[PDB]
């Protein structure tokens, strides 16, 4: 489980209403929940088992002729051209995304919302209710605090600094 102490290799923590996850540096893709790597742009014979997207790898398919495809990892399904958990295949959250609830033996796909929104118990726990979420990210690098960027919490340079953060 991703925590506020998780180191995101080639990435960084982001926070939503109900969970934390790792987000990759520009043009990188998730090969694991804590690991980002470069992505192949086209699966071919020299790119088998190499990353081609978030939680997807290149596979060879023996046939006439031989074919190559980008395949989601185990437990993930291709939905709107992105690999998401199979428990989330039918979950639409609105102002948020679907994550895995593992608090019961039977896992379920539930919604985690953009900052300012929380799951609405009166609306299938979709992200249709206004609610506050306090940031918990430890942003211990030089001149950066927790900032809400495109509806998610992340560590970002303080007001007046740019990328380490410099004036």
């Amino acid at each position, epitope marked *: 489980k991703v925590t506020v102490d998780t180191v995101c290799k080639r990435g960084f923590l982001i926070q939503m209403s109900g969970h934390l996850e790792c987000k990759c540096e520009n043009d990188l893709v998730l090969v694991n929940e804590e690991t980002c790597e470069e992505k192949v742009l086209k699966c071919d014979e020299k790119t088998v088992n190499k990353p081609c997207g978030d939680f997807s790898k290149c596979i060879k398919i023996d046939g006439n002729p031989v074919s190559y495809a980008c395949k989601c990892n185990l437990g993930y399904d291709m939905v709107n051209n992105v690999c998401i958990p199979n428990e989330c295949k*039918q979950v*639409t959250c609105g102002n948020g995304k679907c994550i895995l609830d593992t608090s019961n*033996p*039977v896992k379920t796909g539930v919604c985690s919302c953009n900052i300012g929104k929380v799951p609405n*118990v*009166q609306d299938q*726990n979709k992200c249709s209710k206004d609610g506050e979420t306090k940031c918990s990210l430890k942003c211990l690098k030089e001149q950066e605090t927790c900032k809400a960027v495109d509806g998610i919490y992340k560590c970002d340079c303080k007001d007046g600094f740019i990328i380490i953060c410099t004036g």
Partner: antibody
Amino acid sequence: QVQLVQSGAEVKKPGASVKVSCKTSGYTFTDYYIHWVRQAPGQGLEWMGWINPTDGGTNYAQKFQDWVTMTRDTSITTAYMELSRLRSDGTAVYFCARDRITTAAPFDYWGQGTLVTVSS
Amino acid sequence: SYVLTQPPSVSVAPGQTARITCGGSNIGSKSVHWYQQKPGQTPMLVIYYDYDRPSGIPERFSGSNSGSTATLTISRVEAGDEADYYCQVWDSSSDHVWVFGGGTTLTVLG
């Protein structure tokens, strides 16, 4: 441990009403829907509807909209289903079941069922 | 109305493999759940979200879902697997209902 405990068997006359209960325990009541499923003898499972424990909101299958009323008591984490104007051929077993409040969550726990026999 | 179509009966000998189909319009885009009901007993989840398996369910139970058919596969069938099996999906459309299949009776010839 999650438990859904339904009330005992019922015997009713045609045209009468009956109110079956589903006592829940072992989990946060307001996080899961309570569904009711009807099963006539020798027949298949039939979803009737759900209740939302937080606001008492209900969602019924159209065929049960007219004679089924679902309620709940949050203080004792119990769900209720009231059948009205029972038909003489309406003997059936009724199950309660839960699933996470979200889209398309599976029914992971079920009550043991309640037989309602209809005879004049 | 959205409909799930199951065969009424499947018969297998012990040790054989049983397959139970669940047909539906674009069922591959829906999350399919499977329930086992032994005679006179409470329905019980055996497969959820197409192919996830609850703890206690043996590995020989497996599910798949693609196109218009979701399938429950039971390898090395045992006498204890004799039961009715129901598939289930949520209809995201305006009708806004849960749907059960007609049920499949699995006979294990002992």
